Design a protein around this ligand. Sequence first.
Ligand SMILES: *[C@@H]1O[C@H](CO)[C@@H](O[C@@H]2O[C@H](CO)[C@@H](O[C@@H]3O[C@H](CO)[C@@H](O)[C@H](O)[C@@H]3O)[C@H](O)[C@H]2NC(C)=O)[C@H](O)[C@H]1NC(C)=O
Ligand SMILES: *[C@@H]1O[C@H](CO)[C@@H](O[C@@H]2O[C@H](CO)[C@@H](O[C@@H]3O[C@H](CO)[C@@H](O)[C@H](O)[C@@H]3O)[C@H](O)[C@H]2NC(C)=O)[C@H](O)[C@H]1NC(C)=O
Ligand SMILES: *[C@@H]1O[C@H](CO)[C@@H](O[C@@H]2O[C@H](CO)[C@@H](O[C@@H]3O[C@H](CO)[C@@H](O)[C@H](O)[C@@H]3O)[C@H](O)[C@H]2NC(C)=O)[C@H](O)[C@H]1NC(C)=O
Ligand SMILES: *[C@@H]1O[C@H](CO)[C@@H](O[C@@H]2O[C@H](CO)[C@@H](O)[C@H](O)[C@H]2NC(C)=O)[C@H](O)[C@H]1NC(C)=O
Ligand SMILES: *[C@@H]1O[C@H](CO)[C@@H](O[C@@H]2O[C@H](CO)[C@@H](O)[C@H](O)[C@H]2NC(C)=O)[C@H](O)[C@H]1NC(C)=O
Ligand SMILES: *[C@@H]1O[C@H](CO)[C@@H](O[C@@H]2O[C@H](CO)[C@@H](O)[C@H](O)[C@H]2NC(C)=O)[C@H](O)[C@H]1NC(C)=O
Ligand SMILES: *[C@@H]1O[C@H](CO)[C@@H](O[C@@H]2O[C@H](CO)[C@@H](O)[C@H](O)[C@H]2NC(C)=O)[C@H](O)[C@H]1NC(C)=O
Ligand SMILES: *[C@@H]1O[C@H](CO)[C@@H](O[C@@H]2O[C@H](CO)[C@@H](O)[C@H](O)[C@H]2NC(C)=O)[C@H](O)[C@H]1NC(C)=O
Ligand SMILES: *[C@@H]1O[C@H](CO)[C@@H](O[C@@H]2O[C@H](CO)[C@@H](O)[C@H](O)[C@H]2NC(C)=O)[C@H](O)[C@H]1NC(C)=O
Ligand SMILES: *[C@@H]1O[C@H](CO)[C@@H](O)[C@H](O)[C@H]1NC(C)=O
Ligand SMILES: *[C@@H]1O[C@H](CO)[C@@H](O)[C@H](O)[C@H]1NC(C)=O
Ligand SMILES: *[C@@H]1O[C@H](CO)[C@@H](O)[C@H](O)[C@H]1NC(C)=O
Ligand SMILES: *[C@@H]1O[C@H](CO)[C@@H](O)[C@H](O)[C@H]1NC(C)=O
Ligand SMILES: *[C@@H]1O[C@H](CO)[C@@H](O)[C@H](O)[C@H]1NC(C)=O
Ligand SMILES: *[C@@H]1O[C@H](CO)[C@@H](O)[C@H](O)[C@H]1NC(C)=O
Lengths: 318, 318, 318, 172, 172, 172
Amino acid sequence: NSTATLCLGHHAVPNGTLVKTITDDQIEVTNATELVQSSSTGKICNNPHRILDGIDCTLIDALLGDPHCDVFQNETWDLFVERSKAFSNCYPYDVPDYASLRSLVASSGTLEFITEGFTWTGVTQNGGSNACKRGPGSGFFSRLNWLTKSGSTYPVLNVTMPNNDNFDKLYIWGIHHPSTNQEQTSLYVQASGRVTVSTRRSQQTIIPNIGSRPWVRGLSSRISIYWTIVKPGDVLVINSNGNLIAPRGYFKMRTGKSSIMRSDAPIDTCISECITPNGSIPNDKPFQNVNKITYGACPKYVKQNTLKLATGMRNVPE
Amino acid sequence: NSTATLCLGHHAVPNGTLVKTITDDQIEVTNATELVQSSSTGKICNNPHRILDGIDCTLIDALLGDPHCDVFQNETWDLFVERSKAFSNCYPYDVPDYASLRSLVASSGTLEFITEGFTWTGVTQNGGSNACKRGPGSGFFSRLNWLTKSGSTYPVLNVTMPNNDNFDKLYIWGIHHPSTNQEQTSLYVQASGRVTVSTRRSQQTIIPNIGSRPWVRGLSSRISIYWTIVKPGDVLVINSNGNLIAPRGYFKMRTGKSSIMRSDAPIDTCISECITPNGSIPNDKPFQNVNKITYGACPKYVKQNTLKLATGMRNVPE
Amino acid sequence: NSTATLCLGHHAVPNGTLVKTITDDQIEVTNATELVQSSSTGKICNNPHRILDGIDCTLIDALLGDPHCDVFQNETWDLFVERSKAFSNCYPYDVPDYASLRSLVASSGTLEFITEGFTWTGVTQNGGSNACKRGPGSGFFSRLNWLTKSGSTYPVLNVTMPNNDNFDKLYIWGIHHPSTNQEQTSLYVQASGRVTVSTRRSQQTIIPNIGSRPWVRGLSSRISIYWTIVKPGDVLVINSNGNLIAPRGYFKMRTGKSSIMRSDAPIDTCISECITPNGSIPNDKPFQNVNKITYGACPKYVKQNTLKLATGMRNVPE
Amino acid sequence: GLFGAIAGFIENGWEGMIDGWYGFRHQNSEGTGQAADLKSTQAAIDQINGKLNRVIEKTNEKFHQIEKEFSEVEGRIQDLEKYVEDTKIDLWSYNAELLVALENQHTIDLTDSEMNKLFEKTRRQLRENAEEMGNGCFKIYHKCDNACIESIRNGTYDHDVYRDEALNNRFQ
Amino acid sequence: GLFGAIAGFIENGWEGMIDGWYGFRHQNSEGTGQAADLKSTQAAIDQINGKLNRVIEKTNEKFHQIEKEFSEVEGRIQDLEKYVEDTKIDLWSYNAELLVALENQHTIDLTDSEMNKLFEKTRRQLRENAEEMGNGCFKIYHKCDNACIESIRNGTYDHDVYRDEALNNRFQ
Amino acid sequence: GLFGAIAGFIENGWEGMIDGWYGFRHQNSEGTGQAADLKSTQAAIDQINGKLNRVIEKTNEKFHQIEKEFSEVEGRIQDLEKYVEDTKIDLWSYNAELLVALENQHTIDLTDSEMNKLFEKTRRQLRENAEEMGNGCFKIYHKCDNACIESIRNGTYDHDVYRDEALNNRFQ
Ligand SMILES: *[C@@H]1O[C@H](CO)[C@@H](O[C@@H]2O[C@H](CO)[C@@H](O[C@@H]3O[C@H](CO)[C@@H](O)[C@H](O)[C@@H]3O)[C@H](O)[C@H]2NC(C)=O)[C@H](O)[C@H]1NC(C)=O
Ligand SMILES: *[C@@H]1O[C@H](CO)[C@@H](O[C@@H]2O[C@H](CO)[C@@H](O[C@@H]3O[C@H](CO)[C@@H](O)[C@H](O)[C@@H]3O)[C@H](O)[C@H]2NC(C)=O)[C@H](O)[C@H]1NC(C)=O
Ligand SMILES: *[C@@H]1O[C@H](CO)[C@@H](O[C@@H]2O[C@H](CO)[C@@H](O[C@@H]3O[C@H](CO)[C@@H](O)[C@H](O)[C@@H]3O)[C@H](O)[C@H]2NC(C)=O)[C@H](O)[C@H]1NC(C)=O
Ligand SMILES: *[C@@H]1O[C@H](CO)[C@@H](O[C@@H]2O[C@H](CO)[C@@H](O)[C@H](O)[C@H]2NC(C)=O)[C@H](O)[C@H]1NC(C)=O
Ligand SMILES: *[C@@H]1O[C@H](CO)[C@@H](O[C@@H]2O[C@H](CO)[C@@H](O)[C@H](O)[C@H]2NC(C)=O)[C@H](O)[C@H]1NC(C)=O
Ligand SMILES: *[C@@H]1O[C@H](CO)[C@@H](O[C@@H]2O[C@H](CO)[C@@H](O)[C@H](O)[C@H]2NC(C)=O)[C@H](O)[C@H]1NC(C)=O
Ligand SMILES: *[C@@H]1O[C@H](CO)[C@@H](O[C@@H]2O[C@H](CO)[C@@H](O)[C@H](O)[C@H]2NC(C)=O)[C@H](O)[C@H]1NC(C)=O
Ligand SMILES: *[C@@H]1O[C@H](CO)[C@@H](O[C@@H]2O[C@H](CO)[C@@H](O)[C@H](O)[C@H]2NC(C)=O)[C@H](O)[C@H]1NC(C)=O
Ligand SMILES: *[C@@H]1O[C@H](CO)[C@@H](O[C@@H]2O[C@H](CO)[C@@H](O)[C@H](O)[C@H]2NC(C)=O)[C@H](O)[C@H]1NC(C)=O
Ligand SMILES: *[C@@H]1O[C@H](CO)[C@@H](O)[C@H](O)[C@H]1NC(C)=O
Ligand SMILES: *[C@@H]1O[C@H](CO)[C@@H](O)[C@H](O)[C@H]1NC(C)=O
Ligand SMILES: *[C@@H]1O[C@H](CO)[C@@H](O)[C@H](O)[C@H]1NC(C)=O
Ligand SMILES: *[C@@H]1O[C@H](CO)[C@@H](O)[C@H](O)[C@H]1NC(C)=O
Ligand SMILES: *[C@@H]1O[C@H](CO)[C@@H](O)[C@H](O)[C@H]1NC(C)=O
Ligand SMILES: *[C@@H]1O[C@H](CO)[C@@H](O)[C@H](O)[C@H]1NC(C)=O
């Protein structure tokens, strides 16, 4: 032979992968990669984030000072984990705008409580209850002060507190709703109560609502919980003539990266930067199909478990 | 001749269609299709959806039991149609958070009312009014009970009701705001009223506001309407000492696909899967420019009806 | 030579521009244009918009009639500019839902006030205060009327006002919160006040809250400000027995293009169609990176300082 | 318009073509004729139909939503609802515009590419017995019948039988 | 970069070209020269200008909106407003990025396609009197003047006058 | 699929190719052989890797948001929150779909274009000593060794040394 030949061509694989295009819906290429990630390990790694395990306590009960949450004093968290087996074992209470306070304290990241010296003259301090036993005797919340009449009278309370520091102060107070019209006058000689808490720019006035409620742990009275924020240079004034659950100090308010998450997954000692209510998931892929609630540097939640991007040419086998 | 010729080419049409591209704004192709549908037939087809025509009644009046809406008892709807010629012809009333109740009952899809046996001892039942004539005599709403004093006294009413079923119960009650301070003590011997309705997790307390109002159908008194939801395993307690519009039972609460729509279009016996306040529109196209309020499998509302997609090559005529 | 040559090629520039593509992140082309605009002149041009400079007054104080804002009577604005050096120098007051009223009056565009003849029989009109000196003597707001007892009694006020025009009317009224229980009965003989303002479709009832407040300009009493809107064909009724800051007329309500903006930039006599709190910015580019608060035909706020679009071919130099 | 076949080196279209989108037209020693090519037309039709039926299938089904028309002036909630609605409408109209703008360009370019592919295949078939005349036609330098053009149309042209005659005709 | 003309078989650009974007450069028996081609440059400029003035025309005009900067901490309404604003900003930045990323690629590819179209037209003009030397130039196997290159530039080259001379020059 | 190289005039792929993505395969007077071409494979790999690592880098980091799961029925605020969430999800899923749909098409078209570029370069190298056989191979009309094919592979083929022999072999 006095000639030659030179053929050109490309490679192919036996099994390729089906992808979608602008024209076709199923076209077979030599290789493809996945965009979604939809598996979790099942555990919550405690590095490099600081996880706090709220075993049998919620955030609000650990804030108020429930006697079975006394291990949570001055807890500093980066992510609070709330379990479903949580319950309350103190005086039955109630919070108007519960979600607002829960999100305000969850994103602050501290339970640091500075005690202050208030002067309540004419009343009896450190009221107790048989529904909130702290030890063998009666008790109450550890961050609140239940004031009642001193002998035969209940004068008009009028306390002040200035803010000379350079941070914000969070005060938590409450009001007591009695059960009958006889126990009102036996604790506060006045037939009607009222609580006013005022700063230089806002004011809150609450009046107790006498009535009967369902029995909870042996009581039909209630407590309503309110809060106030004092900014640097401001002042706080508290006026009352009955039905006051006074504060004992203030919480320090911070700003940063902190949150809260409801999950029933255990905690291990691995390392991961993303946390979902199912556990920690790796973050090597841009998308995820596990949970839409996420903390950290997490991939985005998509609806498609399959989503394939072609990284090769078309597959034309023999 | 000892040669030949072979020419290649494509087709063209005399009139083509102008479309927009990435480069050009008006380029002439051989064919194009539209994706926006901006016409309506003018009538609302009653298949395969179940349409209810609220001729002269709104949803709330058909809920309470207006005497000219007594044909709407236990109406089951898939889409409620509200006309603009609707009016009320009973005791003048008022609903705080009207839109919430309207959307709660509209999306439930039933007016099924189970009557219950409440025991009101010490009061007179079945109060009437001359502004709500049901027949030739005085009347009232058919789902509510107007209680007044029995002879010379009005005791403190305190009723229970437990929920032992496996569905939610909706209770509708109200409070009566009188006109003067003389008609208050002539119907309820107490100089001030109060109504408390409580479950194991919530409570509502309302107090009547004596005053004068504009004359509506011959009356200057008013009624305020409230509602309560009892979940399985819960309990309802009603406490009062005057100014109570008691309930007679509960509505059954469901979850599904149901809604409400304001429209003045007639109803015919055609078949269509989409419904707009202008009538039924076909759904062969992905987009529509008729109304942004839609029910069913409807196309999306766009601002532009000129969207032409090319389905052919470019048009180069002779 | 018995041959020739003909070469083809394109142009290049010495310095080109780096742009991003679908494949590459930095590819050098011959030319590119910017999408963002990230600069401002520093002044607010007063053409062709009508700018009003609220030097030392806010909108609400110019509405009520503060004595140092009497130059703002019947001001017609297209954009209100609010400075940070603004203060109040009259009776200390308070507005529930302040942002709602501020946005309602800002978008109306007028302070046109029509005075009406109300008849208050049995009371003393034109009350004054030593905290709101208008000239050398005591004064008050110029759009409100402070009524007190006339000699020894304070009868029950009951005024009416119909709306026979073809536009909406805005009425501004208030209630007076005293400091002690002695100054209440020395101005209004009744031991408790109440103000009711009602139309054919709504009603507002307010009751004064006696108590002490921080000293502001020498006073511990307060005023709360409310408003009412009367539509054509409606009617207004005012009922009271103490603690009423009556109106003197109504503001005319319009609809159009008007707004308000907080800025500390001076005003010059240039021409520009866009206004930001930093000053006027040109609008030749589709995007801007100066401020997200804008008035007029303004470009959109993006987060990039650089997005470059290629308007030439690739750059391959020698 | 990226390949320069349609509206490029082919001057105009053929309005007498009613069988398919692409076709042939020969001028022989026995007369003239015309025909079509099914494969290119079928490829273009399948691609355009796939695209079309790709975009028009539905994705949304909404039953309960928020209120979008109000009879009063209220305040913050109404402002937020109107802002949400305006943002949603403005963000969907841009997508509606961009999808059409991109797909029309891709359709035009693919329908232009099919013609160039057919031309290049026909050029590759006539190895060295034809010359391209620059306006879309080939000058075939040997003598065909009505059965020679049809062998070029159904892809079984044998170039080596007419090679010597064409080479002596075109080069001398 | 899809056709391989710019940054492909044409090594570099011509920085001495100031008349247009695309042009010629011949080496003759009487010297050298240079010129430009208006049609390709005009097509590219018109397409790029159409695209540019397509995207930059305005669509929005907003007068009253919601509050976006707060001085207090309040609760649900403020959270919902901040969420709405964050979602709107994040959804518009993605569009801003993708539009530019797509249009730059299309611009580069079309400015690359115009060169290939000009080259292929010039190749189709010189039917069999020229050979492609592989680096962007044609070797013309007959002898032209400064008036022969200009007939190739303004599209009226007559190939059949120099056919016999070129065929005897290139093949023997 | 716009250039017609892959799945076009090249019938199938080569499953015995494990060195690179594109390569050669010659049939000589001394036997057969096979090799690869690093440059085209490298260009394709770099482009695809750049695209991939372009899209997958992260942009979002959210710490506090709104509530998205409720235990009660409340009214307006809950309706507005659910509407906001539904709108955000529906608007992000469309982008997720469209990005992939566009990028897969561009990847396929660029991996098809690289093959055509390699083919056209190889055609331009063998100036007039080879003929294209229409199925992806060149018939070289002079006699090469295993060192002649490698000069064609590493881009230093000298066409003028075998010109006279090839011209006498192919045309006579
Ligand atoms: C008004 O009616 C309500 C509803 O019946 C009364 O509430 C009921 O109060 C009684 C108090 O004896 C509750 O009985 C208690 O139940 C608990 C739990 O089993 C038990 O430990 C106590 O020893 C006692 O038996 C009853 O459950 C409760 N009903 C509910 C569900 O509310 C209310 O007392 C009445 N008010 C009056 C007295 O006018
Ligand atoms: C305090 O001012 C109010 C509001 O003006 C007075 O209410 C008015 O009371 C009269 C009583 O007759 C109502 O008259 C009724 O008008 C309707 C409509 O024409 C008519 O059909 C009835 O036959 C009757 O005449 C009047 O409507 C009502 N005001 C309004 C605007 O409805 C009130 O009387 C004043 N103080 C008192 C108690 O004298
Ligand atoms: C209950 O506690 C409050 C809080 O101190 C008492 O209010 C205070 O009343 C005094 C009366 O003189 C106010 O004094 C004024 O202070 C300003 C600021 O220096 C000054 O310019 C005036 O000349 C006057 O001295 C004091 O401001 C006010 N408290 C605050 C924080 O403003 C209130 O008196 C107590 N209850 C009573 C009535 O005893
Ligand atoms: C992560 O956890 C969530 C919540 O527990 C899982 O979501 C539920 O999945 C079950 C089974 O498909 C459904 O019946 C529930 O309705 C889902 N709850 C929702 C959507 O709120 C989810 O499947 C888990 N994912 C993985 C990968 O384990
Ligand atoms: C469908 O009905 C709506 C509401 O009746 C129509 O919308 C109105 O159209 C008129 C005339 O253009 C305008 O003056 C109104 O302002 C519109 N009301 C709105 C937008 O709320 C709409 O035109 C109807 N469409 C069709 C196709 O009949
Ligand atoms: C326009 O004005 C705004 C507000 O004054 C400027 O924004 C601030 O910029 C400084 C310096 O970068 C930051 O410390 C502040 O936090 C910014 N305030 C914000 C974002 O609310 C902005 O820089 C000005 N722009 C120009 C071009 O002058
Ligand atoms: C392709 O077209 C050619 C046209 O020439 C067909 O061939 C001819 O077939 C008839 C039928 O037997 C013979 O009588 C002629 O002599 C053939 N002519 C030539 C030049 O071959 C051929 O059959 C067609 N093939 C297909 C598969 O359609
Ligand atoms: C195109 O270019 C050719 C260059 O050759 C122009 O032609 C010449 O025209 C002059 C003017 O009459 C004559 O003297 C020459 O003899 C011509 N030379 C040739 C080779 O034809 C021609 O006029 C140009 N045409 C257009 C429309 O621009
Ligand atoms: C490109 O490939 C050619 C293959 O022919 C290489 O050349 C040969 O080089 C060897 C080594 O000196 C000589 O013995 C042969 O005689 C050469 N043959 C020919 C036909 O030239 C060449 O070295 C390679 N070049 C590069 C840069 O890789
Ligand atoms: C397909 O691509 C992935 C990375 O995108 C790579 O790890 C894998 O080896 C490729 N498949 C083959 C068969 O090479
Ligand atoms: C919490 O921190 C504060 C400030 O450091 C400190 O005063 C207080 O005692 C701490 N709480 C406990 C449990 O000691
Ligand atoms: C244009 O396309 C539509 C469907 O997309 C088709 O019904 C119509 O017949 C086409 N036009 C022509 C002239 O074929
Ligand atoms: C409505 O349905 C309930 C339950 O089936 C029934 O008890 C009641 O009687 C019905 N209403 C009427 C109008 O009968
Ligand atoms: C680049 O483009 C701009 C307009 O897009 C133009 O003003 C400028 O002159 C161009 N640059 C050069 C070097 O021509
Ligand atoms: C404001 O305008 C109204 C109506 O034109 C007029 O009655 C009133 O007197 C004006 N105000 C002043 C300051 O005169």
